[PDB]
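I am writing to request your help with a piece of structural work I have in hand. A protein sequence and the structure tokens that stand for its backbone fold form the material at issue. Please examine both parts with care and let me know of anything in them that strikes you as inconsistent. The record follows directly beneath this note.
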Amino acid sequence: SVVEEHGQLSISNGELVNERGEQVQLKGMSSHGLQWYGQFVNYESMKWLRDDWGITVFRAAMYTSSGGYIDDPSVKEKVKETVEAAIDLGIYVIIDWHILSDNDPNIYKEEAKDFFDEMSELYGDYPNVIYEIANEPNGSDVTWDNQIKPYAEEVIPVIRDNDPNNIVIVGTGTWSQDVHHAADNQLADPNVMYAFHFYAGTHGQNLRDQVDYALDQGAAIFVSEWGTSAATGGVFLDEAQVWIDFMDERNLSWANWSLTHKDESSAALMPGANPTGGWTEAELSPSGTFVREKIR
């Protein structure tokens, strides 16, 4: 199992590494909003993803608003089911506080704190857990220096009282594209990474240059969400492939958006796909077929 092979992850010299200090690259899938598409997230589907697609990380996207956790906190229990499954299956799991329409992470920060205190108390002694404390900060008035970093410096200590070394992923400005500003004003915690998110049908060479810059500043970057579609023509597999090779050349870890059979180009599944896995190439979307291939 990948967790038996690599164990406790850390950051060394801006790179994700295993418990012996060797470089590692995680690849896998993200759930869609747990409050909408939680049926595709369960032991059997994750096991199918582990065995059939070869995923080494699973991302649990728990929305805060839009009928998420703040609206109905019951969804917390689905996060727990997912982590427990990952522990059983021997894979890494991201716990994602999926802010979006609530565009400043400071809006529900007290609730964030309570939630991450609970999760790090429950699972902080396992190496499988990665915390993603603010999915996609956005808005021209939400900046690294003034909003996101101070939020981070409030949430990371609560986690660290329970879990001193698992990785924390911190979102960046403009729907997590602006890794360049975080890179100029990095966090003190040594086991943190900055999120970078793209859409293959929309994002180009300027973004790759910005990623390269952050890496040159010694910042570690996790591509915790990307799609094969345009941000807002179907799928763009040529541009997707350029992005896969870029990530591979820089050993970047990633999670593909979304494990769902939603009628959007980014969805991996066709309507009718069984929520407990075992999918044929029949039930995989053109997106799903390409990603499974990249991961295999």
Remarks:
- The two ends are 15 Å apart (CA to CA).
- The longest strand covers residues 192-199.
- The CA atoms of residues 82 and 126 lie 14 Å apart.
